[PDB]
Design a protein around this ligand. Structure first.
Ligand code: ZN
Ligand code: ZN
Lengths: 746, 146, 48
């Protein structure tokens, strides 16, 4: 709201702000000891939080050299030596909070059974890092005596932590906004170098997102980044997924539609981080339940090492199995038996049995882990796709599928259970589609189709029927939603990785009959690595053309057989003299089999095993036939196969080079090339790392998912409404806050 | 130095110093670097050859035993596919040096059952092994040059 | 040569207006400018 801000700017508020800040500073500096005013300090922390929220909301987004910015600047200038001691107190308390339990603190240990003393604490603090005279004097004054024995460091460091962190982050955001708004102001500069620790402490927790909306203006909005979210970005899994997404968008994806894919990737990565956070180390019926939950958590935590151990066991079993020998007399016909040739020790069959049982156990462990880990992601993907197809499209409402996609019918036949959005966040999807398609179609038909209950209960409440029956025993008879479980089984069995793992399971189970089927598990794990995936993908990239070329080989060899059947019959003689039943070109099928059997394995055509054409007529016809067969068949077929595979390699390398070059020369989010950001040194490096660092948008979206609308700001509410509407106009697109606003005013 | 010193015993070790200086020139460095540019992929492809030939040996051990006879008549101890290790060695020894698959040295499948199974086995072995392996090696080296 | 020709023709169709001689850089001042330029002003099939 511009009018309210303009009216409030011309008011006698800055003096009140200065008075409040001075009063608060003297509150902390005087009334902090005696350990009897915790409630007062909590109240002042809350009041300071509300005050800085008011200041931030008053500032918001504006012109880079606006009047409100100058007013705020002179308010800070008049507030010199009024917030400095507050910042110093916050910095020293944060230092105390982080130092306790960091280094040599579990190694120093004055009292193994008791606590530290005042002199001991002073000596430790002097021996520590970043401690000054007046600061340690004030800390000793604020340190409670408790007879120099009951100094509980654990209860002292965690005393005022969350409000202090919130105030520090908010004041850091405010100072960063003031620094970024005015380009050059020496007063704010020299006010800033004195207070640098409180700014550097919150350096990696300050986001930056640029929006084009809000009356066609560009402003930077700030937010908080959780520590767990920052620590979850260093896993190679997420980086590999991001690289795969970027490659898919650049190569396979088109234009003017990338941003929906970006939002989908952000949502998927948010769900992945939520699953990873849930699957963590900290995590008689109740004991059994918690033991089962802990076991499943441990199993889902370790999944990639289990596949490696399975591969190792497969190699070990295969190496052990390279000892068989077929014998007639069994030492321990149609009675040939298979036995190990050990010749050194008899501890071979027990080793094989133990390794087989261990391999089976690892196989069951990994299939249970896959069922417990990756299935929710696919379920959430399907639910999100159904929500998108039902809300903004009439695939199951306006029109109908044309009986061509079985997945469409299967996804349609789930709209009958109350527990439909099990994992999708926006539970208000049925209400949303009812409100959207409420006037054009009857409400009763929509409720019947979606399985919604009576609309009388929804429109008018009763506030009198709130039952709560006791659980007792056997509460799982109603917990099954039959239809939802059937749909889940269908979608989990139509998948690919689960089908492959099930094939692995059944092949191992069939191999438990002491056979080579364990040795048949080799390539299926040998192709499940990262660095052979590229080679196998290059081979299978031209999947159809190779099959077509093989069919062309079959057609050409067949036509050659037909044209050589009724002209050349006595030449084919694959035997010696005095043998009448030895022709291999009498039957058409046998002649075709012989021509294929030779022309696929050659290098001398067919003339290396057939009677030489002597002076018995048809000499020139036979030789021109054979030489043209050689040339056409062998040269064309081998050359096309080689050309297809070489072209596959070249196409793969070209795609990789193109995607790397495009990522190196454009901003992806913004449409400006790498030429406009060369006016300043390292301009493009800072442009894609500070303004819109790609990963910053995901952090902002995850922050926006939390912090419900009861506490949203204007910008947050606008962004949430825009995201719910799914129109994607708040993205920077053309301008990137460097032009127009900073083109002239800098 | 140490190879020359060991070669001072009047042997061929002096003649073993040839390639080590033959690859220390400027204009062969580019060709040798192009060959060794895809160092890991060639080793992986060789390992894939070993895996595929091993699986073919396993699937051909318990189905085709009387066909392998690398001798003449009136000779009982001449099977080269009885032992698993010997059969694997024979399949590697043939499938790495071929051009006629394995059918240039093994008894022809006559009308004694398993004729179609044996022929489809042999032709798919030829196609997969030889075509895939040679094509991947050629593709790797051409891609290195490019 | 075949792959190069296909890539070149696709890239040229993706970066020029064919009918007009202006490149795909002048229609970036507004969001989705080039998408609307070849779909509304001269959609090629409109001339037929
Ligand atoms: Zn940009
Ligand atoms: Zn045009």
């Amino acid at each position: 709201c511009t009018g309210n801000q303009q009216s409030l700017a011309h008011s006698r508020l800055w003096d009140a702000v200065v008075g409040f800040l001075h009063v608060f500073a003297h509150m902390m500096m005087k009334l902090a000891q005696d350990s009897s005013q915790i409630e007062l300090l909590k109240e002042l922390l809350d009041l300071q939080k509300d005050m800085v929220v008011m200041l931030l909301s008053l500032l918001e987004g504006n012109v880079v050299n606006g009047m409100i910015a100058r007013q705020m600047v002179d308010m800070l200038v008049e507030s010199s030596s009024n917030v400095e001691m507050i910042l110093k107190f916050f910095d020293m308390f944060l230092k105390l909070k982080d130092i306790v339990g960091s280094e040599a603190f579990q190694d120093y240990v004055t009292d193994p059974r008791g606590l530290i003393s005042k002199k001991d604490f002073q000596k430790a603090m002097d021996s520590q890092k970043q401690f000054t005279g007046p600061e340690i004097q004030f800390l000793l004054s604020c340190s409670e005596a408790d007879e120099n024995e009951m100094i509980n460091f654990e209860e002292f460091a965690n005393r005022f932590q969350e409000p202090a962190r919130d105030i520090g982050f908010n004041v850091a955001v405010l100072l960063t906004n003031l620094s970024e708004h005015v380009p050059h102001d020496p007063r704010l500069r020299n006010f800033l170098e004195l207070a640098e620790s409180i700014l550097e402490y919150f350096r990696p927790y300050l986001g930056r997102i640029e929006i084009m909306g809000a009356s066609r203006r560009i402003e930077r909005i700030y937010f908080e980044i959780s520590e767990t979210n920052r620590a979850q970005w260093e896993m190679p899994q997420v980086k590999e997924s991001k690289r795969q997404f970027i490659f898919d968008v650049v190569n396979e994806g088109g234009e003017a539609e990338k941003m929906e894919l970006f939002v989908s990737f952000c949502e998927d990565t948010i769900f992945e981080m939520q699953i990873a956070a849930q699957i963590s180390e900290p995590e008689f019926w109740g004991e059994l339940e918690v033991q089962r939950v802990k076991f499943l958590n441990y199993l889902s935590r370790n999944f990639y090492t289990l596949r490696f151990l399975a591969l190792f066991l497969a190699f070990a079993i295969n190496f052990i199995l390279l000892f068989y020998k077929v014998s007639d007399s069994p030492p321990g016909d149609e009675n040939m038996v298979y036995y190990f040739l050990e010749e050194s020790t008899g501890y071979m069959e027990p080793a094989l049995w133990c390794l087989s049982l261990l391999h089976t156990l690892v196989a069951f462990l990994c299939i249970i882990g896959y069922n417990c880990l990756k299935v929710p992601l696919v379920i959430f993907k399907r639910e999100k796709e159904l929500a998108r197809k039902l809300e903004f499209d009439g695939l199951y409402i306006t029109e109908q599928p044309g009986d061509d996609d079985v997945k469409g019918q299967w996804d349609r036949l789930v709209l009958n259970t109350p527990s439909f959005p099990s994992n999708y966040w926006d539970k208000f999807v049925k209400r949303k589609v009812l409100d959207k398609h409420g006037d054009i179609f009857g409400r009763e038909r929509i409720a019947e189709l979606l399985g919604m209950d009576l609309a009388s209960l929804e429109i008018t409440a009763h506030n009198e029927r709130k039952p709560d029956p006791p659980p007792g025993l056997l509460t799982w008879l109603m917990s099954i939603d039959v239809k939802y479980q059937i749909w889940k089984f269908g979608v989990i069995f139509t998948d690919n990785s689960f089908l492959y793992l099930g094939w692995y399971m059944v092949m191992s189970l069939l191999g438990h009959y002491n056979n080579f089927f364990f040795a048949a598990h080799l390539l299926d794990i040998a192709m499940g690595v990262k660095t052979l995936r590229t080679i196998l993908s290059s081979v299978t990239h031209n999947g159809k053309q190779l099959v077509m070329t093989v069919g062309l080989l079959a057609v050409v060899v067949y036509l050659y057989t037909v044209v050589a059947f009724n002209f050349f019959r006595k030449f084919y003689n694959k035997s010696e003299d005095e043998d009448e039943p030895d022709m291999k070109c009498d039957d058409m099928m046998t002649c075709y089999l012989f021509h294929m059997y030779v022309g696929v394995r050659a290098g001398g055509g067919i003339g290396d095993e057939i009677e030489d054409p002597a002076g018995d007529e048809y000499e020139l016809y036979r030789v021109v036939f054979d030489i043209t067969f050689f040339f056409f068949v062998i040269v064309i077929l081998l050359a096309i196969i080689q050309g297809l595979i070489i072209d596959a390699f070249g196409e793969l390398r070209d795609q990789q080079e193109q995607v790397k070059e495009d990522m190196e020369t454009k901003c992806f989010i913004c449409g400006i090339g790498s030429d406009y950001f060369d006016t300043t040194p390292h301009g493009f490096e800072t442009h894609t790392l500070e303004e819109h660092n790609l990963a910053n948008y995901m952090f902002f979206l995850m922050y926006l998912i939390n912090k419900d609308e009861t506490e949203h700001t204007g910008q947050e509410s606008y962004v949430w409404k825009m995201y719910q509407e799914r129109c994607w106009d708040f993205f920077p697109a053309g301008d990137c806050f460097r032009k127009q606003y900073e083109d002239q005013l800098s």
